[PDB]
Design a protein around this ligand. Structure first.
Ligand SMILES: Nc1ncnc2c1ncn2[C@@H]1O[C@H](COP(=O)(O)OP(=O)(O)O)[C@@H](O)[C@H]1O
Ligand SMILES: Nc1ncnc2c1ncn2[C@@H]1O[C@H](COP(=O)(O)OP(=O)(O)O)[C@@H](O)[C@H]1O
Ligand SMILES: C[C@H](N)[C@@H](CCCCCC(=O)O)NC(=O)OP(=O)(O)O
Ligand SMILES: C[C@H](N)[C@@H](CCCCCC(=O)O)NC(=O)OP(=O)(O)O
Ligand SMILES: [Mg+2]
Ligand SMILES: [Mg+2]
Ligand SMILES: [Mg+2]
Ligand SMILES: [Mg+2]
Lengths: 224, 224
């Protein structure tokens, strides 16, 4: 079955909004979809335990009815690097557990989207990064580019490191994090030339709750 | 003579403040210093022509009295990617001109600091990036890390790409862009472990005009 890892040019650039758009497009195409956020930091207390908003968005945008822990096995309250809060709470983040969770979703879904945390090299322990896990799993990567000053450099750095790891950069998504600026079209043209993967679509600036907006229409899944 | 290229984890992270600190430390060590900002975008009109604030800071922090054009040969008014404003104004950015300017500073200085624009891969034309020029010149690179969420990934991406190019990562500078946060010490420890170059110093959060603050004391030039 189809599996994709979604990374971003940084944290706070649109990975989650773009991931919901991708999931909606896959559902429209007839797939049995599932979103997976194996590691999440920055979560709120509920009667059932900690709940992360990215994980909730991926759960709500899956075509299948999935239990929260299946979408997000590792949940930390504080919004910092996973390795830091993991060490402080004495809750190791294990590659094998993250992989087992992906296999469990593949039991019922034929199209799985995995959202990373932060950018490409976010640490999970003092000797293991998210990039190490993606490399182990050999997942094709989708790059979410938050369109803003400095995004060209971040997109190029990320694309180069992914290719060096021997991984496939399956495509990129342009996310309009702010209202239209002066050099928007020139930035889009530059990003299109420089990123060695197909532009899958552009998500417009949607001020109010973009995670629940009908955004699947902005993704062309036939390019993926 | 000694020459260093200063890059950053992004634009707006402290390259200019850190570069002034480096220049001040070099002057205290007895060097005849010069700052060079070959390409600058985001400049103000004056009777003499456009003047960029980064270039002015580097000029003021040089031990030698340098003419503005020697510090910054290419000045563009609009604060966008250099390649975009260069193409619109029909003023090509030439590698040979940038290199000639560095040689001209080496006529009088024995310690030259070159500040880049934006991050590592900022484009200068549709076929040439700042990274291409640094590679041509074979300059040792100093990485300025703005300490904030997402800086670990950006520092690691930048360090990996520099090393891939066959260049030397001479050191890194921690810049406290905001007041102290909860995980400051853990972030510093992680950055120190992961960046394969000596930490040259840490510049504290200095709200008022940090470019003219006496910051040379925060750099240990014997580690460079
Ligand atoms: N296209 C969009 N239009 C407007 N707001 C957006 C859009 N994309 C993201 N946002 C907002 O920006 C912030 C970061 O987006 P998110 O998808 O959570 O990024 P990341 O997952 O990389 O952290 C969120 O508050 C989100 O609601
Ligand atoms: N250590 C510092 N403390 C407080 N303000 C800082 C500090 N470093 C940079 N700044 C401010 O942050 C902004 C970006 O810093 P600058 O050195 O110009 O970054 P870059 O050169 O990477 O664009 C500027 O307004 C600068 O005055
Ligand atoms: C707190 C932030 N939201 C994030 C982790 C950010 C890690 C930054 C690691 C670094 O400095 O590079 N946790 C999260 O679950 O993922 P994204 O929000 O980036 O999607
Ligand atoms: C406008 C900004 N200040 C800067 C260029 C930013 C280019 C961003 C190219 C990209 O998107 O990666 N011009 C400048 O002269 O250098 P720094 O301010 O980053 O020092
Ligand atoms: Mg986020
Ligand atoms: Mg997210
Ligand atoms: Mg700047
Ligand atoms: Mg600067």
């Amino acid at each position: 079955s189809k599996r994709y890892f979604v990374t971003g040019t940084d944290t706070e650039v649109g990975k989650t909004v773009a991931s919901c758009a991708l999931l909606q497009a896959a559902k429209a195409a007839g797939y049995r979809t599932a979103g997976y956020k194996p590691v999440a930091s920055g979560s709120e207390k509920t009667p059932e335990g900690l709940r992360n908003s990215d994980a909730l968005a991926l759960q709500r945008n899956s075509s299948l009815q999935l239990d929260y822990a299946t979408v997000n096995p590792y949940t930390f309250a504080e919004p910092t690097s996973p390795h830091i809060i993991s060490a402080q709470e004495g809750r190791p983040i294990e590659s094998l557990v993250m992989s087992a969770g992906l296999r469990a979703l593949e039991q019922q879904a034929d199209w799985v989207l995995v959202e990373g945390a932060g950018g490409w090299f976010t640490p999970l322990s003092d000797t293991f990064t998210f990039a190490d896990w993606v490399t182990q799993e050999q997942l094709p990567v989708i790059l979410v580019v938050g369109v803003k000053l400095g995004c060209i450099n971040h997109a190029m750095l990320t694309a180069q490191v992914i290719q060096h790891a021997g991984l496939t950069l399956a495509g990129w998504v342009a996310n309009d994090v702010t209202p239209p600026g002066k050099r928007h079209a020139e930035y889009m043209t530059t990003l299109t030339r420089m990123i060695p993967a197909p532009l899958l679509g552009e998500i417009p600036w949607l001020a109010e709750n973009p995670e629940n907006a009908a955004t699947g229409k902005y993704i062309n899944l036939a390019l993926l």
